[PDB]
């Protein structure tokens, strides 16, 4: 039943047990329950007062860490002769948590999550080597980050009128300023995000499996407000996300094989163990071999 646990449980001393009909060490795994054999019933124990805290394993503490979710580099220069695919002083990113595996695996340790997202934006700038082979200094540039709802109209150029941001939330920040920080609320149309979605989000059969747009926070459009300088620069924007006010449901087996794509849970595994398809754990010579046996 529900109880408040702030420290690990104490150990009580125990005596010799020779009771007929009592077998605390025998269990029935088939029922699906975890064994309830206490250390007091397995061996003879002493009295131990346990003062070890459990606050570091709280779900809030376990998940409320700022983790890198986006890293985008683009050229800040004159883009008249640039290609169509190049980011012309601005970029747009569909917000997701599946691009970097360290946060993705921790988030996928659960089935349902409800949290607000603290967003931090860090900007770095370097002088482009090609063309300007000499270093002249780093300019203090103003950047605009606009939140655009999933599927809505995103700007098509640096000087697009869509940047006027009549109702869209926009944050303007300098490179010399501390990294920009905002808080996006829990914005799912459901009561929690679906970390895994066993279904299709379309009324026809040509939809996307596992992708629920209700779980996508939105789009971030980042541009350099300043017009281009006579020389070119490379600007790298890093977006970090930190969940807060977290509620978690139905913990799941952790990911073992390396991730393949951000759009699904496709798996290939490493060529050989560890974390191979046929062998998750690294091999040993035999089941009678101790890998790190102490020999003196």
């Amino acid at each position: 039943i529900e109880s408040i646990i702030k420290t690990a449980t104490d150990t009580v001393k125990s005596e010799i047990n020779a009771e007929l009909g009592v077998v605390p060490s025998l269990n029935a795994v088939e029922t699906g329950a975890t064994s309830n054999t206490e250390p007091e019933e397995a061996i003879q124990t002493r009295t131990v007062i346990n003062q070890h805290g459990v606050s570091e394993t709280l779900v809030e503490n376990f998940l409320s860490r700022a983790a890198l979710v986006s890293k985008r580099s683009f050229e800040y220069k004159d883009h008249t002769s640039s290609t169509a695919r190049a980011d012309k002083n601005f970029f747009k990113w569909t917000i997701n948590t599946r691009s970097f595996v360290q946060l993705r695996r921790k988030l996928e340790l659960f089935t349902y999550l409800r949290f607000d997202a603290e967003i931090t934006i860090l900007t770095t700038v370097a002088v482009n080597g090609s063309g300007n082979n000499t270093y002249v200094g780093l300019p203090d540039l103003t950047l605009q980050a606009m939140f655009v709802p999933t599927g809505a109209l995103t700007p098509e150029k640096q000087d697009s009128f869509h940047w006027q941001s009549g109702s869209n939330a926009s944050v303007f920040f300098k490179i010399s300023d501390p990294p920009a920080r905002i808080t996006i609320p829990f914005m799912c149309i459901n009561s929690a995000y679906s970390v895994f979605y066993d279904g299709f989000a379309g009324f026809e059969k040509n939809g996307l499996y596992g992708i629920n747009p209700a779980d996508t926070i939105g789009n971030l459009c980042v541009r350099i407000v300043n017009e281009h300088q006579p020389v070119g620069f490379t600007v790298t924007v890093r977006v970090y996300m930190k969940p807060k006010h977290i509620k978690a449901w139905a913990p799941r087996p952790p990911r073992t094989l390396p991730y393949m794509s951000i759009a699904n849970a496709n798996y290939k595994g490493k060529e050989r163990a560890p974390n191979a398809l046929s062998a998750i754990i690294g091999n040993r010579d035999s089941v009678k071999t101790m890998p790190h046996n102490i020999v003196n």
Binding site: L58, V101, Q102, F147, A169, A248, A250
Partner: protein
Amino acid sequence: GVPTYLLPGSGQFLTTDDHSSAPALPCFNPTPEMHIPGQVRNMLEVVQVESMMEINNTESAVGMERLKVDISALTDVDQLLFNIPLDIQLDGPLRNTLVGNISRYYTHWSGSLEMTFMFCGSFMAAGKLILCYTPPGGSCPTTRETAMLGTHIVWDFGLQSSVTLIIPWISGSHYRMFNNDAKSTNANVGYVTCFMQTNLIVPSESSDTCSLIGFIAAKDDFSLRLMRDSPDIGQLDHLHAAEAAYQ
């Protein structure tokens, strides 16, 4: 005006900081909360659930065969069947378990463990085993007369098909830490060994080889400290379709 001065650390971005931040969408009303089964509020709840060990982590075992240990009838007494290493922070049979996976997110661990073995032979199969936990300090025992001197439980096959060996927290220090030195005095926990107590005896019409399944879990006295990035996942490049998020 209020006279102020800036302290060292002003303007820094610390990934583990705890401060309020500006709300991007004012007056936003989040979706009302709905009760969902299986809420988890502490990861120590997950590590208390037993998960299968990969005891048969050999090159001859492929996939699911790595999750069971085969026992046959022997013609010599006091014979060893298998051994299990100690570290939950190192690669081995305990690594790909709930307790192991969660504990590898942390650097310090403490508390007692429990190992549950289920016999999956036929109803007509009989046998007695002995499961021994040996505290660290010496080599892994290779004979039953040496293993029985440590902590042990004698398991008799019967209506109850599962037995539990408790590995009690026997450590000089409050916590055991993780380093890449398996032989350190702050990391080594001991060994687990299985021997035949009498024999495995089956009739002619039953299978002469029977499988054991091993599970491991942590008790309620278990605790973890010093959270760290898990070594069980990583990437050397961008994932597929990650670029499409920028298109």
